[PDB]
Every structure is written in C-alpha cells, then in structure tokens.
Design an enzyme around this catalytic site. Structure first.
Site, PDB file in Angstrom:
ATOM      1  N   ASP A  30     -10.949  -4.678  12.335  1.00 24.29           N
ATOM      2  CA  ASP A  30      -9.853  -5.239  13.114  1.00 24.29           C
ATOM      3  C   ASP A  30     -10.410  -6.406  13.931  1.00 24.29           C
ATOM      4  O   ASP A  30     -11.505  -6.293  14.525  1.00 24.29           O
ATOM      5  CB  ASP A  30      -9.285  -4.214  14.078  1.00 24.29           C
ATOM      6  N   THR A  81       4.990   2.579  18.528  1.00 25.05           N
ATOM      7  CA  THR A  81       4.125   3.689  18.940  1.00 25.05           C
ATOM      8  C   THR A  81       3.705   3.673  20.411  1.00 25.05           C
ATOM      9  O   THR A  81       3.353   4.719  20.945  1.00 25.05           O
ATOM     10  CB  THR A  81       2.829   3.749  18.084  1.00 25.05           C
ATOM     11  N   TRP A 120       5.132  -6.353  14.474  1.00 22.49           N
ATOM     12  CA  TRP A 120       4.947  -7.006  13.170  1.00 22.49           C
ATOM     13  C   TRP A 120       5.237  -6.123  11.939  1.00 22.49           C
ATOM     14  O   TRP A 120       5.892  -6.561  11.001  1.00 22.49           O
ATOM     15  CB  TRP A 120       3.541  -7.615  13.086  1.00 22.49           C
ATOM     16  N   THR A 139      -0.313   0.413  15.998  1.00 22.74           N
ATOM     17  CA  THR A 139      -0.282   0.541  14.537  1.00 22.74           C
ATOM     18  C   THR A 139      -1.305  -0.368  13.864  1.00 22.74           C
ATOM     19  O   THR A 139      -0.955  -1.193  13.039  1.00 22.74           O
ATOM     20  CB  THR A 139       1.142   0.303  13.960  1.00 22.74           C
ATOM     21  N   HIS A 140      -2.571  -0.219  14.242  1.00 23.41           N
ATOM     22  CA  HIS A 140      -3.638  -1.088  13.764  1.00 23.41           C
ATOM     23  C   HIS A 140      -4.409  -0.457  12.615  1.00 23.41           C
ATOM     24  O   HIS A 140      -4.852  -1.153  11.699  1.00 23.41           O
ATOM     25  CB  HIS A 140      -4.633  -1.326  14.891  1.00 23.41           C
TER      26      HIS A 140
HETATM   27  O1  LIG Z   1       9.937   6.631  14.578  1.00 22.87           O
HETATM   28  C1  LIG Z   1       9.129   5.842  14.097  1.00 22.87           C
HETATM   29  C2  LIG Z   1       8.640   4.759  14.843  1.00 22.87           C
HETATM   30  C3  LIG Z   1       7.718   3.893  14.254  1.00 22.87           C
HETATM   31  N1  LIG Z   1       7.306   4.119  12.956  1.00 22.87           N
HETATM   32  C4  LIG Z   1       6.337   3.226  12.296  1.00 22.87           C
HETATM   33  O2  LIG Z   1       5.366   2.738  13.210  1.00 22.87           O
HETATM   34  C5  LIG Z   1       5.024   1.403  12.902  1.00 22.87           C
HETATM   35  C6  LIG Z   1       5.280   0.547  14.137  1.00 22.87           C
HETATM   36  O3  LIG Z   1       4.453  -0.577  14.058  1.00 22.87           O
HETATM   37  P1  LIG Z   1       4.739  -1.962  14.816  1.00 22.87           P
HETATM   38  O4  LIG Z   1       3.746  -3.017  14.461  1.00 22.87           O
HETATM   39  O5  LIG Z   1       6.099  -2.366  14.455  1.00 22.87           O
HETATM   40  O6  LIG Z   1       4.699  -1.665  16.399  1.00 22.87           O
HETATM   41  P2  LIG Z   1       3.518  -0.908  17.198  1.00 22.87           P
HETATM   42  O7  LIG Z   1       3.709   0.536  17.052  1.00 22.87           O
HETATM   43  O8  LIG Z   1       2.198  -1.311  16.675  1.00 22.87           O
HETATM   44  O9  LIG Z   1       3.627  -1.323  18.628  1.00 22.87           O
HETATM   45  C7  LIG Z   1       5.899   0.974  11.730  1.00 22.87           C
HETATM   46  O10 LIG Z   1       5.178   1.071  10.521  1.00 22.87           O
HETATM   47  C8  LIG Z   1       7.029   1.982  11.743  1.00 22.87           C
HETATM   48  O11 LIG Z   1       7.594   2.177  10.464  1.00 22.87           O
HETATM   49  C9  LIG Z   1       7.800   5.196  12.231  1.00 22.87           C
HETATM   50  O12 LIG Z   1       7.437   5.396  11.068  1.00 22.87           O
HETATM   51  N2  LIG Z   1       8.709   6.055  12.805  1.00 22.87           N
HETATM   52  O1  LIG Z   2      -2.101  -2.340  20.425  1.00 21.44           O
HETATM   53  C1  LIG Z   2      -1.935  -3.441  21.215  1.00 21.44           C
HETATM   54  C2  LIG Z   2      -1.876  -4.732  20.705  1.00 21.44           C
HETATM   55  O2  LIG Z   2      -1.992  -4.902  19.355  1.00 21.44           O
HETATM   56  C3  LIG Z   2      -1.689  -5.811  21.598  1.00 21.44           C
HETATM   57  C4  LIG Z   2      -1.664  -7.241  21.139  1.00 21.44           C
HETATM   58  C5  LIG Z   2      -1.314  -7.616  19.837  1.00 21.44           C
HETATM   59  C6  LIG Z   2      -1.341  -8.956  19.445  1.00 21.44           C
HETATM   60  C7  LIG Z   2      -1.727  -9.931  20.364  1.00 21.44           C
HETATM   61  O3  LIG Z   2      -1.759 -11.233  20.002  1.00 21.44           O
HETATM   62  C8  LIG Z   2      -2.091  -9.576  21.659  1.00 21.44           C
HETATM   63  O4  LIG Z   2      -2.474 -10.547  22.539  1.00 21.44           O
HETATM   64  C9  LIG Z   2      -2.076  -8.232  22.044  1.00 21.44           C
HETATM   65  O5  LIG Z   2      -1.600  -5.599  22.845  1.00 21.44           O
HETATM   66  C10 LIG Z   2      -1.641  -4.445  23.367  1.00 21.44           C
HETATM   67  C11 LIG Z   2      -1.508  -4.309  24.748  1.00 21.44           C
HETATM   68  C12 LIG Z   2      -1.548  -3.046  25.327  1.00 21.44           C
HETATM   69  O6  LIG Z   2      -1.421  -2.941  26.675  1.00 21.44           O
HETATM   70  C13 LIG Z   2      -1.713  -1.896  24.542  1.00 21.44           C
HETATM   71  C14 LIG Z   2      -1.840  -2.009  23.156  1.00 21.44           C
HETATM   72  O7  LIG Z   2      -2.015  -0.894  22.373  1.00 21.44           O
HETATM   73  C15 LIG Z   2      -1.814  -3.287  22.583  1.00 21.44           C
END
Ligand SMILES: O=c1ccn([C@@H]2O[C@H](COP(=O)(O)OP(=O)(O)O)[C@@H](O)[C@H]2O)c(=O)[nH]1
Ligand SMILES: O=c1c(O)c(-c2ccc(O)c(O)c2)oc2cc(O)cc(O)c12
Length: 438
Positions: free
Chosen positions: A110, A262, A335, A14-15
C-alpha cells in the site's frame, strides 16, 4: 531463486481487500512466483475468510503494546500500527523467507507504507506501491510541496471555493476539496507527515499502480506518467472480477441504498435527518448502519419503516448495487463504493467527510456527472427528499443513468481484450515476475 513477492497491506478501512484482489490476479498470471501477504491478524481473518496455492498470508503486529490503555484520540490505532510497522513488516518477511527458502525479490505495498521505499532500497528489490484510491487523490499527494507553496499553510479562509487549476486534470477541484494534511487540518500529525513523505517518495517507485483506467481522464493520466517513473492503471477491479430476496419483490429503480463504508458514520443529527427523509417520502430503502449507531435513530422509525425499508449492520453491497430494484446510492464517496455503483448503473448522492472523499464527490458531481450533491454538504430532511425525487422520479436521474451507462462502457473496454488496463496488467505481471538482481 524464482520470485518471492512480499505484499504489505495497510490494515485500515478498505485497503487490504483490493490489494489481495490484485495479488490473486498476479498469482494466477505468475504461477512460478510465491506471494507472502502481510497484514494484522484481524485484517487477514476478515479478507481471507479457491485461494491460489502460491499465496500465503502472515500476521504481523498491530503495534499495540501488551498493557496499552487507549487515550481515545482519532488515528490512535493508525499511529500505533504505523510506528511499529517498519519492524513488524521486517519480522514478518524474515518469517516468510525462512519458510519458502526464497529471499524477497519484489516489494508490493500500500502506498501509505511510504517507508517500503526504504525497505526495498535496503533489500535491493523493486518497490511497487499500490494506490488504493483515485488518480485525483494520487495527484494532490504527488503535488504536495507545489500545492503548499502556491496556497500557503496558514489557512484557506475566504479562499475555499478557489480552483486548483494550476494542476493538470484538476481544473474543477476547489481548495476546500483537498484532503486533510495538504493545506488544512493538523499538518503536524503523524498521518499528515506520513502522507507528505509518501508524496515525495512515490516518484522514486519502480512503478505505481492503481485501481482505475487511463481513459477516466487522459490529461491526468498523462500528467501522472510524467511525474512518476511508471504509472499503471489496472482497473476497475470489479469489472474484471436476505437482501437480494427482499429486492426481488421491488419495482425497478425504486430502492435507495445507504452506506458510509467501513470507517465513517454521519453525526447523530444527520442520522436523524436521513431517517426523516426516508420516512416522509416512504421510499423503499436498505440502510447499512452500525448496530451501535441504531441508538441514534428516532424513536419509532424502525417500526414506521418496517413495511418498506431495512436497517442492517452489513449488506452485500456490490450485489445490492447491481440489482435492478436499486435507483440511488447515498454514499460517503469512497473509491471502491463508487466503482460498484458504476458497475450497477446507480446514481450517487454524495456526503463526503474526510480523506479523498471530497475529491471523489467533486469528480462524481462536476466531472463525471454521475451523481448529485446535498445542498449545504450536510444531511437535511428536505435536501435528501429533493435528491431522491431528482434521481428516482425526474429527468435528472434519467441523465445520470445515461452518463453511468456511457462511463461503464468505456471502463469495460479498458479491461477487455486489448484494453489499456489489460495491457498495463501485463506490464505489472512482468515487474513482479522479475527475480531479484544478483
Ligand atoms: O454494508 C456494507 C458496507 C460496505 N461494504 C463494502 O466496503 C467497501 C467500502 O469501501 P470504500 O472505499 O467505498 O470506503 P471505505 O470503507 O474504505 O471508507 C466496499 O467494497 C463496499 O462494497 C459492504 O460490502 N457492505
Ligand atoms: O483509511 C483511511 C484513508 O484511506 C484515508 C485517506 C485516503 C486517501 C487520501 O488521499 C488521504 O489523504 C487519506 O484517510 C483516512 C483518515 C482517517 O482518519 C482514517 C482512515 O482509515 C483513513
């Protein structure tokens, strides 16, 4: 010419979405500037699906060669994207410059795109990296060399619960909480080296900005302002900017919402364990689970839970968490998810896997006291049934909710008139509004 801001997204997890969210705010605040948003076609189609007239997106290469057969490694997609990205972004920008008739005057990216610093140096423009996660993870990357020196790079066996108290604002983080690529995991992977380099170069940025507020942790805020040229907290974003019909009919604070974001899924055994806890307690629930992962559900689960729970491939998460029916959130500790739970006032049940998830879990449990840990760090039937009881039915949940109300009020004030985040955003608007040096 007037400003032309190039924006380079990291098209995984989710970047890209939160980066577009700020760009939208920046485009409204600097209407004379044009913005060119660069991500993969898959990424753009998803996040761009009311848009400020001065923003246009551009599809850049995912770095996958024409006849490529995946080896099936982890981070394979990231590796391919990353190696091509210097060239992919460059060519994207060539195109945006040709279309607008404006040279790139500012480079927003990013923080993961660490070579953006070198691109900005070569272009003669400011480099404004966006850290998409918490100040906790920002701080360990910035301190990478110091951490490796203090701890060593040959393992932390027997030292897992030692404290990182030699870092300001980080007194409560244990060695084990660190992300892969700091002192453990594959230190030689492209991803570990990318993060190492990022860490070393962030202090050179014109400004680093972040989706958080200063008052989250004053000491950490102050420490980071001393390690970076300019450090700008400009969030939380989500306070600035059939599921619901189902929720309508539930009792207040009674529903458990489950999601792992995600790019994360618990192993099949933990999928089983969670289904057993949901079933045994008969707690109302909404479980955001990949359709492909449904094969790991115990036979009969869907049919037995049909009267009180939903399993869906995607939920409207933010709105679910803001609904009065929801009383707990089983989470990977991402986050963006965290701040959505805070906005709703929902306590967290944390099951962190990798990246910054362990750091966020530690913050939730030990620092902010807005959530709980599962005993032993893995899902078990009984461990989860206990967390549900604690939060939905017992005094613990009352306290967590109080803590959440207080945290959210502080956060609201950071983004209100005269708030620290409101002020920092003016500073960032001024940076992106600057035309290119002559
Ligand atoms: O069923 C879902 C699962 C996730 N999200 C959205 O996906 C993002 C997840 O971001 P997060 O940083 O928490 O975890 P990441 O997906 O990056 O690992 C958030 O905005 C959630 O609201 C959503 O809308 N529906
Ligand atoms: O999307 C990713 C991500 O944000 C991070 C992450 C975030 C914050 C940190 O401080 C860090 O060290 C790594 O790791 C990942 C590792 C994976 O294998 C795959 C990913 O998609 C992510």
């Amino acid at each position: 010419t007037n400003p032309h801001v190039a924006v380079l997204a990291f098209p995984f997890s989710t970047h890209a979405a939160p980066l577009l969210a700020v760009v939208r705010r920046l485009a409204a605040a600097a209407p004379h500037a044009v913005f060119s948003f660069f991500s993969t076609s898959q990424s753009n189609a998803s996040i761009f699906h009311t848009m400020q007239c001065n923003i246009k997106s551009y599809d850049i290469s995912d770095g996958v060669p024409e006849g490529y057969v995946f080896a099936g490694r982890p981070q394979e997609d990231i590796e391919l994207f990353t190696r091509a990205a210097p060239e992919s972004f460059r060519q994207g920008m060539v195109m945006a410059v040709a279309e607008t008739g404006r040279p790139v005057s500012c480079l927003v990216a990013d923080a993961f795109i660490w070579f953006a610093a070198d691109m900005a140096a070569e272009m003669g423009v400011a480099w404004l990296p966006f850290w998409t996660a918490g100040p906790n993870s920002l701080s360990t990357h910035v301190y990478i060399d110091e951490i490796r020196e203090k701890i060593g790079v040959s393992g932390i066996q027997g030292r897992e619960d030692e404290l990182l108290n030699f870092i300001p604002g980080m007194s409560k983080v244990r060695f084990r909480d660190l992300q892969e690529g700091i002192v453990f995991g594959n230190l030689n992977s492209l991803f570990s080296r990318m993060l190492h380099r990022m860490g070393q170069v962030l202090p050179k940025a014109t400004a680093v900005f972040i989706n958080s507020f200063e008052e989250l942790d004053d000491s950490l805020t102050n420490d980071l302002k001393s390690k970076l040229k300019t450090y700008l907290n400009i969030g939380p974003f989500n306070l600035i900017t059939g599921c619901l019909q189902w929720l309508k009919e539930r009792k207040p604070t009674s529903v458990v919402y489950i999601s792992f974001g995600t790019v994360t899924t618990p192993p099949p055994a933990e999928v089983v364990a969670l289904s057993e806890a949901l079933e045994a307690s008969r707690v109302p629930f909404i479980w955001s689970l990949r359709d492909k992962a449904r094969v790991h559900l115990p036979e009969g689960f869907l049919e037995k839970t049909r009267g009180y729970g939903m399993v869906v491939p995607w939920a409207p998460q933010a709105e679910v968490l803001a609904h009065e029916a929801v009383g707990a959130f089983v989470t990977h500790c991402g986050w963006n998810s965290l701040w959505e739970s805070v906005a709703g006032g929902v306590p967290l049940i944390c099951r962190p896997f990798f990246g910054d998830q362990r750091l966020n879990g530690r913050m939730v449990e030990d620092v902010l006291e807005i959530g709980v840990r599962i005993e032993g760090g893995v899902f078990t039937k009984s461990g989860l049934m206990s967390c549900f009881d604690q939060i939905l039915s017992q005094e613990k949940g009352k306290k967590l909710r109080e803590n959440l109300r207080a945290l959210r009020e502080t956060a609201d004030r950071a983004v209100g008139p005269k708030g620290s985040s409101t002020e920092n955003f003016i500073t960032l608007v001024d940076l992106v509004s600057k035309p290119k040096d002559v």
